[PDB]
């Protein structure tokens, strides 16, 4: 669950 | 998405374009800066990414594998292109221009220095335009991991595009063909010079140098 | 040189091709880490010496200068030994054809550390090639294209060569009946499998250097100076 | 000069 997986879903 | 005319897909892409961020006015003040800029810059990349049409059509473990594999590619290339005006010298910010010597302040960094500064030099010979740059550096997130059909399609996309901008400016069929290859062997510079950027990165890692983000670590890590 | 119509700029290249060599792979005993590297870097070292004559006889090379040569070759030397095996890997799925005598799959890749992710990638490579029925006459373009583009901006006669060959794989996108939307988007499905090619290299050459560090197989004088020219 | 200079010149 790494950082840039959820950064790629912001607002 | 895959139905964009040619000009609809250079109009997106400059549209999707990253701002141009800035610096702050020895060996660990200026891998400090760079990397401290390289760090606000991946976060303006992975939205300017989302924009590139096709892309947020990707699972997300494929968007992720994508920009892990892009992501130094993608800052070389934007780096070429700003300094592509200064012959000699490397535009990492507006007020970092940095020319070939001061290179040498870090270990091992001149060589990919001179490497970058060759292939500004190289935009500078072709006279690279800016539309062409958006399409070359789209190019490189959806190529660059894609092997480790729909992007296919979108690549193909981005290809005609390349072709009908070149059309648009009068070059003949062979002009064409000729320019399309001499871009996109180009590419393969970047990769290169990527892979070299990796290894200096990883060793400045490792000999704590400089203290390095996370989102900056992760993306070292993938590699 | 710059006079060769596409089709005696084709014939040229097919003529320079080198052999097929042979691995001396015994079958005797198993694979340690120790001998598979013997076996890859023996065969390559042979490799080696037939494509300094083979690029002698790539159009527009022996022009240059000695020191020229020496660079274009000592940048590119994996990368065309590289993209030699994954077109004769083309009808081998799940293996690597380094030598007819020497088909490898990727558990065979992992009696060397650091290999099996490297199989891999050029597994993959080899499986592009096959869903874009890559022709003969499209690779020998691709491998001329290596070694003069690969080294080029580590900086002109070089760049109208590159036109030519440019100008030859669409000619025979054209000849194989292809339109003219398909010549430009298979010119650059081609290219850009060339930066994968690169990155392999890379990785290629750094697993190498790091097996040569480790004291795990001895190099030929030819192998260690073509990998001292890179880490 | 590197060896690789030499066997360049073979023929
Ligand atoms: C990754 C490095 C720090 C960040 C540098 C950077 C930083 C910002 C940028 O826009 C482009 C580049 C390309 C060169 C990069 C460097 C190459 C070696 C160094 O470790
Ligand atoms: C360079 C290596 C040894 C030689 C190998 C070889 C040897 C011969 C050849 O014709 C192709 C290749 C590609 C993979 C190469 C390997 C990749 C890593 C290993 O160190």
Redesign the interface.
Known sequence: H????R????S | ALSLTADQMVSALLDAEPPILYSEYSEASMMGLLTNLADRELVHMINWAKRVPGFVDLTLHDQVHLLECAWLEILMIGLVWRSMEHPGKLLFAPNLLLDRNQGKCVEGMVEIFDMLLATSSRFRMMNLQGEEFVCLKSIILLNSGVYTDHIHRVLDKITDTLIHLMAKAGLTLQQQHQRLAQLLLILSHIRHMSNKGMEHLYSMKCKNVVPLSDLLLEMLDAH
Chains 1, 4 share one sequence.
């Open positions: 790494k950082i840039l997986h950064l790629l879903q912001d």
